[PDB]
PDB file of C-alpha atoms in Angstrom:
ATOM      1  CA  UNK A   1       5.177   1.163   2.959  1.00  0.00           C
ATOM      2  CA  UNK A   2       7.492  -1.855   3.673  1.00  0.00           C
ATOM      3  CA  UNK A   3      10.237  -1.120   6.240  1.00  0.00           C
ATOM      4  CA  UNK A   4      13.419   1.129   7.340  1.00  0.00           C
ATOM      5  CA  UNK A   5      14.984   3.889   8.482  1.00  0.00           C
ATOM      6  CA  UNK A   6      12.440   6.304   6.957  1.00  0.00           C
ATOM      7  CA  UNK A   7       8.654   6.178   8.030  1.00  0.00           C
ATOM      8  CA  UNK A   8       8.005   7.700   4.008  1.00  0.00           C
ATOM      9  CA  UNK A   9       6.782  10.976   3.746  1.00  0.00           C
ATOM     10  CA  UNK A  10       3.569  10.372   1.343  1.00  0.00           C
ATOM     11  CA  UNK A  11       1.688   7.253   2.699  1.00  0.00           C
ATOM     12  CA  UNK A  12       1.217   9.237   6.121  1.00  0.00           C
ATOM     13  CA  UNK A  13      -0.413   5.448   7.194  1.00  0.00           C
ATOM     14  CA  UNK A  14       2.516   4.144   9.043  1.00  0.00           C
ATOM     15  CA  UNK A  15       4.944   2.069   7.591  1.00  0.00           C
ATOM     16  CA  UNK A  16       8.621   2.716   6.193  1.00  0.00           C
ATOM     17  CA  UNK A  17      10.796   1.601   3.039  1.00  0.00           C
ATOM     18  CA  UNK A  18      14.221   3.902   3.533  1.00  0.00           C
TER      19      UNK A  18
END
């Protein structure tokens, strides 16, 4: 939810935050 290197592993949407 935001952006970086990591696409988050919870929000499973498709966004990032590192």
């Amino acid at each position: 939810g935001g952006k970086g290197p990591i696409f988050e592993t919870w929000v499973t949407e498709g966004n990032y935050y590192g």
